[PDB]
Amino acid sequence: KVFGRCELAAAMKRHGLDNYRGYSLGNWVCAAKFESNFNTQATNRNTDGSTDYGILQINSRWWCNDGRTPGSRNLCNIPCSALLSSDITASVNCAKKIVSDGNGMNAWVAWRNRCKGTDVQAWIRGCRL
């Protein structure tokens, strides 16, 4: 599923991401924009052989099981395919664990490089929230 901007903002809010670990909703929307272009089915292979999955491009090296990332963990206790669902529950729940890991949203390199410090509220401007 390719979410609309405000549609994703609303789903993220209902699932408790607005101000989760202090990160306003716009930060989450901005991260999803540049990670996946709001597409739940996005996948990308990393140089190390791990793969990133879903709207927030969660990596198989630590967070989910895809059966093909040697030496990796599955800290979110989910198959990586669950992160590709039209239902964002699994991605949100796993994102909460990631953002709590110590480095906040810097875990998402695209957030650090493209969202951090910018006017992230723009991402939720106009949305019924």
Catalytic residue set: 35, 52
Is residue 104 at the binding interface for Cl ion, with CB under 5 A as the rule? yes
Q: How far apart are CA 123 and CA 119, in angstroms?
A: 8
Q: How many residues bind Cl ion (CB under 5 A)?
A: 12
Q: Which of residues 49 and 87 has its CB atom nearest to Cl ion in the complex?
A: 49
Minimum distance, C-beta of residue 128 to Rh ion, in the bound complex (Å): 12
Task: Judge whether 66 is annotated as a binding position.
Answer: no
SS3 assignment for 25-43: HHHHHHHHHHHHCCECCCE
Binding site for Na ion (CB under 5 A): 60, 65, 69, 72, 74
Is residue 39 at the binding interface for Cl ion, with CB under 5 A as the rule? no
Is residue 54 at the binding interface for Cl ion, with CB under 5 A as the rule? no
Is residue 74 at the binding interface for Cl ion, with CB under 5 A as the rule? yes
DSSP codes, 66-119: -S-STT---TT-SBGGGGGSSS-HHHHHHHHHHHTSSSGGGGSHHHHHHTTTS-
Q: Which of residues 87 and 125 has its CB atom nearest to Cl ion in the complex?
A: 125
Beta carbons of 92 and 12 less than 8 angstroms apart: yes
Q: Which of residues 18 and 81 has its CB atom nearest to Rh ion in the complex?
A: 18
- Cα 41 → chain centroid: 12
Phi and psi at 72, nearest 5°, equal -80, 170
Interacting residues with Cl ion (CB under 5 A):
5, 24-26, 65, 69, 72-74, 79, 104, 121
Annotated binding site: 101
